[PDB]
From Swiss-Prot, chains A, B:
It comes from the Bacteria. The chain holds residues 5 to 93 of 106 of the full protein. Induction: Negatively autoregulated. Is most likely cotranscribed with glnD. Transcriptional regulator probably involved in the response to nitrogen levels. Down-regulates its own expression as well as the expression of the downstream gene, glnD, which encodes the [Protein-PII] uridylyltransferase, a key enzyme in the nitrogen regulation system. Acts by binding to a specific palindromic DNA sequence (5'-TGTNANTNACA-3') in its 5'-untranslated region. This is Neisseria hypothetical transcription factor.
Length: 89, 89
């Protein structure tokens, strides 16, 4: 029932890029927002707001989400358009 | 006279990875720490301390350094070992 991002993010909008990627990766893991937050030791309200681009998130919290999601931190800031471009073209 | 990083960073240490990359890219541009700080509208003391891994830097400041350096934000978090691996292997 876990839904993916509806639209591609502006590649320049780093918050939008992060939010897209967080949601894509957590959904691939079968994780709700709440579950991702529990995995990182972050407040579920905070994680949900990050996905709505509300917070100037610190590097340490990027690092924790990336560790919980099992990806390199830089993959959270890599626009999905670029990832796909590299992956399939 | 602008010197490059002395050692490769621990790829897991995101602060170390950022500091390596900031210094590599700014040196490629002919920029001191002070100059990079002026380019981003950041305090030179703060930029110098980021390169010594002292600060839990926010996403907005990552974005500003990346815009001043003319690179994608995610390249600041991409370990130089990986970059080289992709670039030449």
């Amino acid at each position: 029932k876990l839904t993916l991002p509806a639209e591609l993010p502006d590649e320049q909008d780093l918050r939008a890029v992060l939010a897209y990627n967080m949601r894509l990766f957590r959904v691939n893991k079968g994780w709700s927002q709440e579950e991702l937050a529990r995995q990182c030791g972050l407040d579920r309200t905070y994680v949900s707001a990050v996905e709505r681009k509300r917070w100037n998130i610190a590097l340490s919290n990027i690092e924790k989400m990336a560790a919980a999601l099992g990806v390199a931190a830089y993959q959270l800031l890599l626009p999905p358009q670029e990832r796909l471009k590299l992956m399939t073209n």
